[PDB]
Ligand SMILES: NC(=O)c1ccc[n+]([C@@H]2O[C@H](COP(=O)([O-])OP(=O)(O)OC[C@H]3O[C@@H](n4cnc5c(N)ncnc54)[C@H](OP(=O)(O)O)[C@@H]3O)[C@@H](O)[C@H]2O)c1
């Protein structure tokens with residue numbers, strides 16, 4: 001289950017959420033957590049990362065494409081271009097690698113969920129209620145089985161915990 005044969009197409013989702021399920025607001029993530037940034041890099045490095053066009057927009061121009069990973073951006077706009085990366089019009093076109101991490105945002109998590117067999121979640125204990133127009137984490141049905149870590153404490157003074165979910 002843990003090994004990925006090279007002829008397969010494994011799809012995982014990775015996200016960080018507040019306890020309310022908020023993942024994004026106003027084109028940004030409404031907190032910063034260094035431990036989550038390190039965790040995201042550790043999981044995704046060396047693999048293909050797939051993101052929605054609005055998540056590409058949310059990365060500073062100087063930092064994208066993200067290093068050490070093949071960057072794929074989803075857009076329906078025939079004139080949207082992502083310098084340094086590949087833009088495709090569907091998840092089917094994006095999922096050609098043996099191991100793909102979908103890195104957001106809310107629309108693309110919902111789109112990719114039917115094909116995903118792993119989710120890696122960071123939950124931040126920050127009280128941020130859901131507001132209209134927020135991007136939200138996908139909801140996971142009972143086909144998913146999860147492990148929840150104990151609450152840990154960030155150098156930034158926020159509690160956080162990690163979840164790992166899997167399905168067949
Ligand atoms: N906390 C986290 O872990 C995390 C991670 C990533 C992002 N974020 C945040 O989440 C927010 C962005 O999320 P979002 O839901 O607004 O947008 P998104 O999922 O990042 O991108 C949505 C865009 O993807 C394209 N798209 C969607 N469905 C498609 C399909 N079926 N085929 C092809 N292209 C498709 C469209 O691009 P076009 O409009 O160009 O057609 C659409 O506008 C930001 O606030 C960002 O900072 C948070």
Ligand SMILES: CCc1nc(N)nc(N)c1OCCCOc1ccccc1N1CCC(C(=O)O)CC1
Nearest residue numbers: 014015016029036037040041066067102103104122
């Ligand atoms: C790190 C945020 C994050 N967390 C988990 N758990 N899942 C995700 N999908 C996810 O969003 C990745 C795309 C947005 O990124 C950022 C947003 C705000 C601050 C920092 C970052 N990043 C730090 C690492 C860097 C890199 O890895 O090069 C890319 C930029």
